[PDB]
């Protein structure tokens, strides 16, 4: 019913048919990925990580986050540097919980 997965470095609590956003995974939209690291599943929680517990997910999109403008400025010191960041993400939805 619920699981604690570790995609990238973050931990997500996921239900059935739940769409959450993780860091870029380098996978085309439409494929069927299998998340490996699972912490808690149902009621049996493994200490380091559960063995053979897999979370089957489908990748929906590979969009980018909102633009972030980093403007570093040293007051009265002739230093105004500007930079932009658009962090890529990937959205994926849970399909089935492997036993």
């Amino acid at each position: 019913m619920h699981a604690i997965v570790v995609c990238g470095s973050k931990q997500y609590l996921v239900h059935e048919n739940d769409t959450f956003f993780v860091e870029k995974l380098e996978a085309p939209v439409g494929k069927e990925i299998q998340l490996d690291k699972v912490l808690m599943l149902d009621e049996k929680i493994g200490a380091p990580y559960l063995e053979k517990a897999r979370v089957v997910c489908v990748v929906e999109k590979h969009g980018l986050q909102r633009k972030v403008n980093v403007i570093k400025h040293i007051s009265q010191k002739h230093h105004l540097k500007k930079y932009g960041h658009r962090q890529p993400y990937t959205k994926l939805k849970v399909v089935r919980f492997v036993h």
Binding site: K10, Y12, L13, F20, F21, Y89
Partner: protein, 144 residues
């Protein structure tokens, strides 16, 4: 990216409580009163929604101050004029106005805020066993 946590959307599970300060220390009573008023002890704490329960304090004149603080520690209030600094000893506060003393002690343990006004409002402090607050059906808990 990640999943955001749940925060209460102006949900009011607030309830009424009763405590008896028969022999409770001023500071030891005030710390738990502030925790109860702020709702910090609640499982779900959203710090912009004042999710904290009301509290009524009985027997304010019966509280105690340890040591020689009843005659050596002074409470100070200054008006905006010159010389308007009024001083009251611990014993005088414990006799003349004990409700104000407990009220001020609880207020001092709260963050400078625009919600702290409402938080200190939800403290009903009485100097006697009687109280006009029995229509709220407040539950009774000790040493809180």
């Amino acid at each position: 990216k990640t999943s955001m946590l749940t925060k209460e959307q102006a949900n009011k599970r607030r309830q009424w409580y009763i405590v008896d300060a028969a022999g409770l220390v001023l500071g030891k009573l005030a710390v738990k009163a502030a925790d109860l008023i702020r709702g910090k002890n609640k499982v779900d704490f959203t710090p912009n929604q004042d999710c904290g329960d009301y509290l009524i304090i009985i027997n304010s004149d019966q509280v105690v101050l340890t040591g020689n603080k009843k005659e050596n520690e002074f409470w100070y209030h200054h008006s905006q004029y010159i010389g308007g600094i009024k001083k009251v000893s611990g014993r005088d506060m414990l006799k003349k106005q004990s409700d104000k003393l407990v009220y001020n002690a609880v207020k001092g343990m709260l963050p400078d805020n625009r919600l702290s006004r409402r938080w200190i409002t939800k403290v009903h402090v009485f100097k006697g066993d009687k109280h006009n607050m029995e229509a709220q059906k407040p539950t009774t808990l000790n040493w809180s």
